[PDB]
Design a protein around this ligand. Structure first.
Ligand SMILES: *C(=O)C[C@@H]1O[C@@H](C)[C@@H](O)[C@@H](O)[C@@H]1O
Ligand SMILES: [Ca+2]
Ligand SMILES: [Ca+2]
Ligand SMILES: [Ca+2]
Length: 114
């Protein structure tokens, strides 16, 4: 199944933050309605924040997270969770190798903001 794709409410500001846990340099691209809106890159085996940014979901609300390492797409896992019918997390893990820890880049999207 497709992973890393989320439909947010339209025209909503959201946070996106990426952490790294891999010897490979992670590149995280965040697309809004299929256009790149943010790109983070970095390397850590200790959960360092490689980027954090506030974006806008636009008219469609479609947000996609893509992760690659040296140009090769990582395998993604994702889900969205809503607490008290208000607080939203869109969660992504990614795997660049064979150990299947799925933490090589971890991406968290949260809304609402403010
Ligand atoms: C390459 O070494 C594999 C890569 O980096 C490791 C340190 C570990 O985080 C592994 O999960 C990751 O796929
Ligand atoms: Ca891994
Ligand atoms: Ca890892
Ligand atoms: Ca508040």
């Amino acid at each position: 199944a497709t992973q890393g794709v989320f439909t947010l409410p339209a025209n909503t500001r959201f946070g996106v933050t990426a952490f790294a846990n891999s010897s490979g340099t992670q590149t995280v691209n965040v697309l809004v309605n299929n256009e790149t809106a943010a790109t983070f890159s970095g390397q850590s085996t200790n959960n360092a924040v490689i980027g954090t940014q506030v974006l806008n979901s636009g008219s469609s609300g479609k947000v996609q997270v893509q992760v690659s390492v040296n140009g090769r797409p990582s395998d993604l896992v994702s889900a969205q969770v809503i607490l008290t019918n208000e607080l939203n997390f869109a969660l992504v893990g990614s795997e660049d190798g064979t150990d299947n820890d799925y933490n090589d880049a971890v991406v968290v999207i949260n809304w609402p903001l403010g």
